[PDB]
């Protein structure tokens, strides 16, 4: 414990540092440092009152909210386990991602608490349920969860669970990923795009994602600002880009093909960096009409926390940039021997960016981890400068 | 170690990323990020086979050159404890910490040779003894360390021993800090002074302190250089800033002062970083003479990893700066409960820049953390925007 540094530290850290500073932007109102503490505190008693160790998983099916937001924190600060469902997914793989998460407490959004109530009788050790609107069902009010008992942090450290993010191999496979994987993983975002509490995300990606949630976790720690929505629309990411000053985004095409289209270069004025997949006809676009503003050629996955190779695009076109500080990455043949500048291979990992291991699944880990490599399933090559460029699927 | 990242791989990205930069000017001898890794192979595998084993110690008591700078690196990359000895102390003060650590190789500096070998014989694991320059007596030259066995390296983890830092207690106590306590805290100098490959550090300070150790390796892990000089001279020191492009360095009083003396603040320029500990005199001369060059408040110490807090002086001038990324720090009662801002307490700090705890000395690491705190020995007050103000020992 005497060594670790969590998010529950981030979260302590900003509201020393930050107080009345803007922590998120979300649906209409403004939830500073300080009170995003105070929120987080009383649902992380609430979540010990109904019988949460660490460890334990908490479920939600929900889109972005300032519930889902809080209910995050809530799960850092007592070392429990995140299960944020994907709301794309069928009532089947649903039930599935549930059933494999196996929580201890199930919170569902506005719009699936019909989905939830269904797969709900088929979960062991759910200790409580809610909702966020009000308990129609089986399901408390989310505003029951809160208590007002003072809280008394259990003990966990960094390198715990913190999230399973279950991505379709076939069935769908959880991947868990610890505090510090993202803490560690993240540091390089806030290092690469020089963040401080000044910065601001617009967090338009679904929660549930790994860019999602890394993004929004990414100016947290910084002691920045997301704006958070519950739905895409291009012509709302403008006004808000705009309006609350947005410095950095993550994204995937064609959301920026459509922000640009629907936006005057001076809506955009504020914009410095971005990433995420994109063509370059769009991301040369996006540099045209935003000077000032740099995209950020990536590659990552949820096994590796997120980001792994980063770089300016205009550094290297087409590449998905250079390893970052904590990961050593190499392109492997099939006997895992690293192959030289130019030729295809496996893209590996190193370092503690590297997932915990799949949630039930001994053997996709044993694979995925095998000679002492974390295996990304993807495969690509170096040139001789050390940008990485994506070659496809296995 | 899968989930390991240690200074071997830093040393390894440089090389891949970086070859053709430089690492370090040692006296105008200059070395690339590939030869750095080349060499320090090459010294690791003579390590290896003169029979160190990750978690022994490899002393050196040597003022600043090339091969303490390789050595640092070939150390790291088997997983080896270094013991750098500071050699500002007598000979019974060498004798005991040289005693202390327990070394398996000793490296004499050319001008230490007499001292190393009048404590030799009380030694008891040295399986080596080497001597930097030429061979003399009991030491075979530090030429001699290299060998052409191709490197394999030893399984070991980041938080592995790294370092032993001896600073006086009377009686020296040896703080061990590992390769992931050096590189986790110092990746926020990196932050904070927006450090790439590009910039340029002048190591005017002696390697055997963590101050000096700390800015080679973050430069280092940006991928930058540092210049690295035996003794400080300031007139020398303003020439190196100009014909070296120094972008940031380290300073203990009176060493600013006396370089803006001998510079021509035009040979200054490239400055954009200072730190260290200096009076406000100083401080503000300096930032009168260099407009775009940025003083940094910090108090730090070997436990913490080096620095602790940090903020430009211009911000909160005669504070120490407020905590950086990674640290968890407060203020004590004497029954360590954290005091409310204003009230002066012990200087208190939780995570992965805390130190290992003493080297064979029980008794004071449990004092150090007691609580699950780790204890500085200083004190201090906090104000409300978070800055640390110093209040002594
Ligand atoms: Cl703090």
Redesign the interface.
């Given at each position: 414990?005497?060594?670790?540094?969590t998010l529950a530290?981030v979260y302590?850290?900003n509201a020393?540092?930050f107080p009345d500073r803007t922590a998120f932007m979300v649906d209409g109102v403004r939830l500073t440092h300080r009170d995003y503490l105070a929120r987080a505190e009383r649902l992380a008693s609430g979540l010990l009152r109904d019988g949460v160790h660490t460890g334990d998983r908490v479920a939600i099916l929900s889109q972005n909210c300032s519930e889902m937001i809080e209910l995050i924190g809530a799960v850092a600060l007592i070392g429990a386990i995140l299960l944020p469902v994907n709301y794309r997914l069928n009532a089947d793989e649903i039930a599935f991602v549930l059933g494999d998460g196996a929580p201890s407490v199930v919170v569902a959004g506005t719009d699936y608490r019909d989905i939830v109530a269904g797969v709900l009788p088929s979960l062991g050790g759910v200790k409580k349920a809610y909702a966020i609107g009000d308990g129609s069902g089986p399901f408390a009010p989310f505003k029951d969860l809160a208590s007002d008992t003072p809280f008394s942090a259990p003990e966990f450290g960094?390198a715990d669970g913190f999230v399973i993010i279950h991505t379709a191999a076939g069935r769908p496979r959880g991947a868990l990923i610890s505090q510090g994987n993202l803490l560690?993983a993240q540091?390089s975002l806030?290092?690469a795009w020089?963040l401080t509490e000044a910065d601001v995300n617009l967090g338009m990606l679904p929660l549930f994602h790994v860019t999602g949630l890394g993004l929004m976790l990414t100016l947290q720690?910084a002691g920045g600002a997301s704006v958070i929505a519950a739905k895409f629309d291009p012509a709302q990411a403008a006004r808000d880009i705009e309006a609350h000053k947005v410095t950095v985004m993550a994204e995937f095409a064609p959301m920026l093909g459509n922000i640009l289209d629907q936006a005057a270069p001076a809506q955009l004025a504020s914009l410095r960096a971005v990433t995420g997949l994109d063509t370059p006809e769009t991301i040369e676009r996006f540099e045209a009409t935003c000077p000032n503003a740099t995209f950020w050629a990536t590659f990552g996955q949820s096994e590796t926390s997120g980001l792994s190779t980063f770089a300016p695009y205009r550094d290297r076109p087409k590449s998905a940039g250079?390893?970052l500080?904590?990961?050593?990455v190499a392109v492997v043949d099939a006997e895992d021997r690293p192959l030289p500048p130019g030729e295809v291979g496996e893209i590996v990992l190193?370092?503690?960016t590297?997932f915990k291991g799949y949630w039930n699944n001994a053997a996709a880990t044993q694979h995925a981890?095998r000679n002492?490599?974390?295996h990304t399933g993807d495969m690509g090559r170096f040139d001789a400068?050390?940008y990485l460029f994506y070659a496809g699927r296995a």
């Open positions: 414990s005497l060594h670790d540094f530290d302590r850290r020393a540092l960094a560690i540091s806030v290092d020089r720690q250079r390893p500080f904590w990961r050593t190193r370092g503690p590297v981890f002492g490599w974390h400068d050390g």
